[PDB]
Amino acid sequence: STEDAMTVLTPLTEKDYEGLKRVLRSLQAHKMAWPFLEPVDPNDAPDYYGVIKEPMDLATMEERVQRRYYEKLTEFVADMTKIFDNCRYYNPSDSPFYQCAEVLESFFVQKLKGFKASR
Ligand SMILES: Cn1ncc(N[C@@H]2CCNC2)c(Cl)c1=O
Domains and CATH numbers, the chain: 2-118 (1.20.920.10)
- Our answer on whether the CB atom of 115 is closer than 6 Å to any ligand 1 atom is no
Going by CA atoms, what residue is nearest to atom 15 of ligand 1? Answer: 87
What's the sign of the alpha-carbon dihedral 35, 40, 43, 46? positive
Q: Where are the alpha helices (DSSP H) in the chain?
A: 2-9, 14-29, 48-51, 58-66, 73-90, 96-118
Query: Which of 89, 97, 99 most suits a substitution to test ligand 1, by most atoms within 8 Å of the C-beta?
Result: 97
- Our answer on whether the CB atom of 36 is closer than 6 Å to any ligand 1 atom is yes
The whole-angstrom separation of Cα 35 and Cα 97 is: 7
- For this PDB entry, the determination method is X-ray
The whole-angstrom separation of Cα 4 and Cα 97 is: 30
* DSSP structure class, residue 41: P
Cα(88) to centroid of ligand 1, in Å? 11
* DSSP structure class, residue 39: P
Going by CA atoms, what residue is nearest to atom 8 of ligand 1? Answer: 35
Cα(97) to centroid of ligand 1, in Å? 7
The whole-angstrom separation of Cα 9 and Cα 72 is: 7
Contact 106, 32 (CB under 8 A): no
Q: Resolution of this entry in Å?
A: 1.4
Torsion of CA 74, 75, 76, 80, to 10 degrees: 100
Give 9's contacts (C-beta < 8 A, 6+ positions apart).
Answer: 72
